[PDB]
């Protein structure tokens, strides 16, 4: 009654029969902006079906020597579907997300992942190596899009913060002896109630193998990791022509 | 006894070798791509030989140290280039040269050896680039800030974001050389014996292929015969070459044995089978993979215009017309004194291209060898100093 689930929203459902449990980030569901909070005076659009779908984005192969990946949300979906068309026309934006990452393996493979969220995941550099040149990260390390980006130094998460206490932020583990998926429901976290969808990326989805993959030779050596996400309770405002960046 | 030509502090042969008094003239020739999009569609390329770009060189020696009771000498050989304008067609800092983009073909190579694979494959995908770019002459040859190489520098701080064909070669050395002067024997005079502490090369297949022979090519040993074989190791070609006898020449008023770089340096022989890396599968005759000794750059060293090379590469590029007189490598040596009279070092820098489906900037390009640039480095002895050597 906990191992088996089904998440239907929009026209797309996903079934899982070896889940762990759904955690709701910071204990509350995504919701619409109340009139106590809103400052924009134009009526928002709320598509309510066409953008609240599980978008399956990409597939990272996980071998025995991987480091970890990250996806900046919502810039994984400003190139995809009716979410990517409404977020490019409209200046303002708010939504929550239901984030579901699948990674199946046999009952002989082993290894654990820490799929975790963290809001305002800013990216530092190696500062020129020795630490004296103020190098800023490029635009693709900042906002990789639906392609994702691989961590260089996952012990410090490319930001000088340790991964050992990433477990404070909303997370759950995918260890291949127990579960194969990890649902994380995230509300809209930001100070101001709407923001731009092209500039500001509210959070980043860190997916790091902490305990590495291991399997005896003869088993299937290709163990993919696919993340599917669904913008919940999304609404846009401030209509103008299409910007792409 | 001609012991007058030695490298002793107190001799006039050491004065010519420490400071070469005769200028060296190098003319940089380029290839301009006329149909760049049609190569991406898969058509036959059409180029244009563009020049001349006359540089006058500067030469000296630094860090000269002796040893083993005077017979072993070790110094560096700096080389600074100064452009000459009246002997060139136009101002190089305006002259736009359209060719391949060598840094974005370098970092595709790095993805093939899994050297920063997912970092570089994120660069060329989100930042769409051009296989064919157009920069000036001084940018393409003396450093220019690349887009993608400026992004690798913040991930890896060792990578220089400035690419150039001869980048950081103005006033810098090409190794810590050590030589063998003629205090013991006049057969081995200023011969390269070791390189940066290492005895010989280390990246070739066999230990016969690794052996560094001969000199750097500045001045040779005297008493040259017609039947002996001289060996030259330039630091650009990354092996030791030899030179064969050509004909009788006449430099001003002195004897000359014209020696030329033969076709059997880069031919398809059983000796040159071991210079194709890794397993002897050669791209063709007359070409050489030198991608190891340029820090991973897909460069091919060959004669200009595929001279003494395969014909199926000549017919692949419209404009390749090699001949004997204009695109060879030769040297005029005084047979009595070993002073180089008139030389011309002509070598072509090519960039290998092939259609790879994971990089959608290559279009539909054929697997071939593409012309980029070549240069005639010429040295010449004038009228007054020729008459100084007519006495001896
Ligand atoms: C001129 O000259 C120049 C110079 O030389 C040149 O260059 C060149 O090039 C070429 C071409 O490209 C090259 O080759 C290549 O290479 C490559 C690479 O390799 C490298 O790398 C690797 C990687 O690794 C990774 O992974 C692993 C697993 O796999 C792991 O373990 C590790 O750790 C790593 O990881 C990393 O990374 C990743 C990525 O992804 C990430 O993710 C992570 O994170 C991390 O970081 C490596 O490994 C290698 O290594 C090597 O070496 C060493 C030394 O030190 C050793 O120790 C080792 O062991 C190794 O060795 C081995 O291996 C190799 C392979 O690899 C071999 O070869 C050898 O022999 C031995 O055995 C390196 O470093 C590669 O890949 C390739 O290979 C391929 O190909 C071939 C032919 O071609 C074949 O034979 C093979 O087999 C392969 O195939 C494969 O692959 C493909 C693609 O990918 C596919 O498609 C197919 O299908 C296949 O697959 C299959 O099979 C397999 C088996 O193998 C299996 O598994 C699967 O499943 C399937 O079934 C090639 O080889 C080279 O390299 C270069 N060079 C150099 C020096 O390098 C040029 O070219 C010239 N030019 C002209 C014109 O020619
Ligand atoms: C460094 O190396 C470069 C080349 O790598 C040398 O530059 C070449 O020098 C030669 C000789 O000075 C030049 O050749 C000359 O070209 C003239 C024009 O040629 C064009 O037109 C003819 C038709 O007339 C075409 O067939 C040809 O393809 C060219 O498009 C010729 O008129 C000259 O002919 C003279 O010599 C021949 C030799 O047989 C005689 O028969 C003639 O009667 C006449 O006297 C001559 O062939 C060549 O153009 C130069 N190339 C470039 C790109 O400049 C450098 O000289 C060399 N050294 C230095 C210091 O840089
Ligand atoms: C190698 O080949 C390439 C293309 O095959 C060639 O590049 C082109 O050269 C032309 C001529 O220099 C460039 O055209 C110029 O562009 C500037 C910038 O806008 C214009 O201001 C220029 O206008 C002048 O045009 C006349 C002179 O040509 C004058 O009468 C007029 O009043 C203007 O002053 C001119 O159009 C062109 O931009 C490049 N193209 C690219 C993509 O770089 C290159 O020149 C060739 N190199 C050599 C050495 O031959
Ligand atoms: C550097 O110089 C050395 C010595 O001068 C070269 O080694 C020699 O290379 C020649 C190549 O012609 C070898 O000759 C061969 O002889 C056999 C018969 O023995 C003949 O059948 C072959 O056709 C070939 O001519 C010679 O054996 C070899 N000697 C040694 C000790 O290796 C070397 O090749 C030069 N390397 C470079 C990069 O210049
Ligand atoms: C390479 O460096 C040399 C050494 O400075 C440069 O040559 C001098 O440049 C100065 C700059 O004003 C000028 O006085 C002359 O052009 C040169 N002087 C002498 C005495 O040679 C040269 O410009 C540099 N070349 C490149 C391509 O970088
Ligand atoms: C360079 O020489 C080698 C050695 O003969 C050639 O390799 C042979 O090529 C023929 C075809 O011409 C094949 O039938 C043989 O089986 C090959 N033998 C070996 C041992 O590889 C090579 O093809 C020549 N290069 C070129 C471009 O023709
Ligand atoms: C050459 O000249 C004299 C000879 O003793 C010496 O003082 C000088 O230092 C020598 N130069 C070098 C570079 O060794
Ligand atoms: C050079 O001089 C003679 C002639 O070959 C020889 O005895 C000597 O060992 C040679 N030295 C080197 C380093 O080649």
Automatic annotation (TrEMBL), chain A:
Whether Lipoprotein counts among this entry's keywords is yes
GO BP annotations listed: symbiont genome entry into host cell via pore formation in plasma membrane; symbiont-mediated suppression of host gene expression; virion attachment to host cell
Residue ranges of every copy of the Picornavirus capsid domain listed in the record: 15-214
- Judging by the UniProt lineage, the source's domain of life is Viruses
State the GO CC annotations.
host cell cytoplasm; viral capsid
Keywords for this entry? Answer: Capsid protein, Eukaryotic host gene expression shutoff by virus, Eukaryotic host translation shutoff by virus, Host cytoplasm, Host gene expression shutoff by virus, Host-virus interaction, Lipoprotein, Magnesium, Myristate, Pore-mediated penetration of viral genome into host cell, T=pseudo3 icosahedral capsid protein, Viral attachment to host cell, Viral penetration into host cytoplasm, Virion, Virus entry into host cell
Does the keyword Lipoprotein feature in the UniProt annotation? yes
Q: Give its localization.
A: Host cytoplasm; Virion
Gene Ontology molecular function, alphabetical: structural molecule activity
Subunit organization: Interacts with capsid protein VP1 and capsid protein VP3 to form heterotrimeric protomers.
Q: What does this protein do?
A: Component of immature procapsids, which is cleaved into capsid proteins VP4 and VP2 after maturation. Allows the capsid to remain inactive before the maturation step. Lies on the inner surface of the capsid shell. After binding to the host receptor, the capsid undergoes conformational changes. Capsid protein VP4 is released, Capsid protein VP1 N-terminus is externalized, and together, they shape a pore in the host membrane through which the viral genome is translocated into the host cell cytoplasm.
| Family listed | Belongs to the picornaviruses polyprotein family.
User: Which protein are we looking at?
Assistant: Genome polyprotein
Species of the source: Human enterovirus 71 (EV71)
Mapped onto the parent protein, the portion here is 79 to 323 of 862
């Amino acid at each position: 009654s906990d191992r088996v689930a089904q998440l239907t929203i929009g026209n797309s459902t996903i079934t899982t029969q070896e889940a762990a449990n759904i955690i709701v980030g910071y204990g509350e569901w995504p919701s619409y902006c109340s009139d106590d909070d809103a400052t924009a005076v134009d009526k928002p659009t709320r598509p309510d079906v066409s953008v609240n779908r599980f978008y399956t984005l990409d597939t990272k192969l996980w071998e025995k020597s991987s480091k970890g990946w990250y996806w900046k949300f919502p810039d994984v979906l400003t190139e995809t579907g009716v979410f990517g068309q409404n977020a490019q026309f409209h200046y303002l934006y708010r939504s929550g997300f239901c984030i579901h990452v699948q990674c199946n393996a046999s009952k002989f493979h082993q290894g654990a992942l820490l799929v975790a969220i963290l809001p305002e995941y800013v990216i530092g550099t190696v500062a020129g190596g020795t630490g004296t040149e103020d190098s800023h990260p490029p635009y693709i390390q900042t906002q990789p899009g639906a392609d994702g980006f691989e961590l260089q130094h996952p012990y410090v998460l490319d930001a000088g913060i340790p991964i050992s206490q990433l477990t404070v932020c909303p997370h759950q583990w995918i260890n291949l002896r127990t579960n194969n998926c990890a649902t994380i429901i995230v509300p809209y976290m930001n100070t101001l109630p709407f923001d731009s969808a092209l500039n500001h990326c509210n959070f980043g989805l860190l997916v790091v193998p902490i305990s590495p993959l291991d399997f005896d030779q003869g088993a299937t050596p290709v163990i993919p990791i696919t993340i599917t996400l669904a913008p919940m309770c999304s609404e846009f405002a401030g209509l103008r022509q299409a910007v792409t960046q | 006894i001609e012991k007058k030509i030695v490298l002793r502090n107190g001799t006039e042969a050491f004065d010519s070798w420490e400071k070469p008094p005769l200028p060296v003239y190098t003319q940089f020739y380029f290839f301009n791509v006329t149909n760049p999009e049609e190569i991406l569609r898969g058509e036959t390329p059409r180029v244009e030989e563009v020049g001349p770009y006359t540089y006058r060189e500067l030469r000296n020696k630094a860090n000269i140290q002796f040893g083993d009771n005077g017979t072993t000498i070790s110094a560096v050989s700096n080389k600074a280039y100064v452009f000459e304008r009246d002997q060139s067609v136009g101002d190089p800092k305006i002259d736009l040269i359209r060719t391949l983009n060598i840094p974005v073909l370098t970092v595709i190579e790095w993805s093939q050896v899994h050297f920063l694979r997912e970092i570089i494959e994120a660069m060329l995908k989100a930042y769409q680039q051009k296989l064919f770019v157009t920069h000036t002459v001084d940018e393409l040859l003396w450093g220019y800030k690349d887009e993608i190489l400026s992004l690798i520098h913040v991930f890896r701080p060792d990578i220089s974001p400035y690419f150039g064909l001869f980048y950081e070669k103005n006033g810098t050395n090409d190794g810590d050389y050590v030589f063998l002067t003629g205090e013991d024997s006049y057969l081995n005079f200023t011969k390269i014996v070791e390189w940066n502490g290492k005895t010989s090369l280390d990246w070739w297949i066999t230990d016969k292929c690794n052996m560094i022979n001969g000199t750097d090519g500045d001045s040779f040993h005297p008493l040259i015969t017609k039947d002996e074989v001289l060996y030259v190791f330039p630091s650009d070609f990354c092996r030791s070459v030899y030179i064969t006898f050509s004909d009788y020449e006449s430099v001003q008023g002195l004897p000359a044995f014209r020696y030329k770089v033969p076709a059997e340096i880069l031919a398809n022989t059983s000796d040159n089978a071991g210079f194709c890396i890794p397993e002897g599968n050669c791209l063709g005759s007359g070409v050489l993979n030198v991608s190891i000794c340029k820090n991973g750059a897909p460069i091919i060293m060959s004669f200009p215009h595929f001279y003494q090379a395969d014909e199926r590469f000549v017919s692949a590029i419209e404009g390749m017309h090699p001949n004997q007189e204009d695109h060879e490598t030769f040297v005029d040596i005084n047979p009595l004194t070993g002073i180089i009279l008139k030389a011309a070092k002509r070598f072509q820098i090519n960039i290998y291209v092939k259609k790879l489906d994971d990089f959608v900037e290559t279009g539909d390009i054929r697997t071939m060898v593409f012309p980029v640039m070549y240069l005639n480095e010429s040295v010449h002895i004038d009228k007054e100093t020729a008459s100084r050597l007519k006495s001896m």
